[PDB]
């Protein structure tokens, strides 16, 4: 047991410590208003159920693009085994709209031990609650 990952029954893996997830998406191979493309490791790629993309304006208001309890998975592994987080996917076929270089473009990750299979006692489906983990956050002009 890595003691780092938070195992469970069947003695599998369903999530590590934040500092562990952060370290994987630590290396970004490419970022654009269409999606990331970092290099995520299979050991982690497993515990994650999806990502959450949001645009935080200079003042302080944050908009979640794929704001949905089930649109959470916008990731997908390729040929060269590189993960491409697809912003454009759940933003109705449109890429990210940044109207000001200083708006940040946060992208969170959700360990499976936090993922919600369905709504709640509020008939709510928002990405609030879902304990997310930031993994990337470059301003607007740092993106390009």
């Amino acid at each position, epitope marked *: 047991r890595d003691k780092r990952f938070h195992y469970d029954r069947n003695n599998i893996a369903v999530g590590a410590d934040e500092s562990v997830v952060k370290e994987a998406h630590r290396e970004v191979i490419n970022s654009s208003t269409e999606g990331l493309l970092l290099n995520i490791d299979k050991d982690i790629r497993k515990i994650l159920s999806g990502y959450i993309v949001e645009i935080e*304006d200079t*003042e302080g*208001l944050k*908009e979640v693009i794929n704001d949905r309890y089930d649109m959470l998975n916008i990731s997908s592994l390729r040929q060269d085994g590189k993960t491409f987080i697809d912003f454009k996917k759940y*933003n*109705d*076929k*449109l*890429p990210l*709209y940044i*109207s*000001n270089p200083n708006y940040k473009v946060n992208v969170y990750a959700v360990t499976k031990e936090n993922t919600i299979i369905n709504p709640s006692e509020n008939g709510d489906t*928002s990405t609030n609650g879902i304990k997310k983990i930031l993994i990337f956050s470059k301003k607007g002009y740092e993106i390009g």
Partner: single-chain antibody
Amino acid sequence: KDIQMTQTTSSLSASLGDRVTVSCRASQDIRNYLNWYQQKPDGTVKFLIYYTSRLQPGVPSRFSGSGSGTDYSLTINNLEQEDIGTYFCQQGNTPPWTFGGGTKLEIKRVQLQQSGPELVKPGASVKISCKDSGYAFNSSWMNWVKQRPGQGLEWIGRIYPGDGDSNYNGKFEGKAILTADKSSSTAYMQLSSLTSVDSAVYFCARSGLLRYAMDYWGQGTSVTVSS
């Protein structure tokens, strides 16, 4: 149902240099997904603020949106002759999108080219045409909004030229038929079987970059219907 937007103050006048305030008011937490548009005097339509307070580039710093929950409001610090117009506030949380009723502001004392005005005999179809001239046609949606006095604005539907997917409104399920032609950047609506009811204007606002906001609007198309 349709999230019903309410603009209690239907109209107002105010000298220049005044701090005008236009207030919208949703019928259920729309969670910030609200935008404001200004309808100039020249029957045109400008996209101003999206997502409650983010200003569209170009808008003069003296504007500003506010709120959260079900009480959003535009505030025009020290008014200026070129701000006159009728402001609407379309929500954009849970489709179908629905606009307010407009708060006509007075003064107390062409990338999207639409078709020509139609005139039909009660019971005939028509085909209005939105002719985008820009470059982002098959890469940006196309919403068709319907304006008629007293009825703020009703979102009809939209199609995405680039592939063919489309969405409609419940009241217009059986009326409009959105068709588009990727080769000549053009959309077409087809109000089939008209009535004295359809007699209205029909703008064709294209929503590109912002699924819940139409940035460029056509000019309109007076589709009046006789007896």
